């Protein structure tokens, strides 16, 4: 079970790593669309 | 010589049986150790569960922090754009 | 009949030394069982530990990346504000 809940943490961590880049680019994309 | 021989043999039997009692004591200590070794591994797994909890709690806070960051940048950007 | 007695004692000494041999073999089997059991559980646990510390170092870097992401977005609000 630990192998496993360590991989729910792991999966959610990686998705969050993604969301960070998604957000920053989403903002930069939108701001630069304003110029 | 049958007399000396009886005495030697009794000494040897005594030493053999003392030795057998000690080796049985040692077997008993090994059996108890198998138990203790099992308990120790368990305790290791509990430490691991503590680590996993701390990490879930941290992850959760970072998720909340991202959400809050997005929300307030959405309001910032709304007013910067209401101009 | 200390001659019959001698033969008896020789038999009893043979049975005691046989017993000792067997109990020693038993002890060795317990020591091997302990070793095998420890090797197995260590495998499992070293795996769980690897996964834990990976989680931990990652989440550490994600604390960093969150601050850093907020910084980047803020510089974007700075530029957007120059207008």
Author numbering:
A (entry chain A): 419 to 453
B (entry chain B), C (entry chain C): 552 to 634
Please quote the authors directly:
In this process, small GTPase Rab5 functions as a master regulator of the early endosomal biogenesis. Rabex-5 is a specific GEF for Rab5, Rab17, and Rab21. The GEF activity of Rabex-5 is autoinhibited by its CC domain and is activated by the binding of Rabaptin-5 via its C2-1 domain.
Rabex-5CC also forms a long α-helix (52 Å) and packs in parallel with the C-terminal regions of Rabaptin-5C212 to form a tight three-helix bundle. The interactions between Rabex-5CC and Rabaptin-5C212 are essentially the same as those in the R2Δ complex. Interestingly, Rabaptin-5C212 assumes a linear conformation in the Rabex-5CC-Rabaptin-5C212 structure but a V-shaped conformation in the R2Δ structure, and in both structures, the C-terminal regions of Rabaptin-5C212 bind one Rabex-5CC and two symmetry-related Rabaptin-5C212 dimerize through the N-terminal regions which are the binding site for GAT.
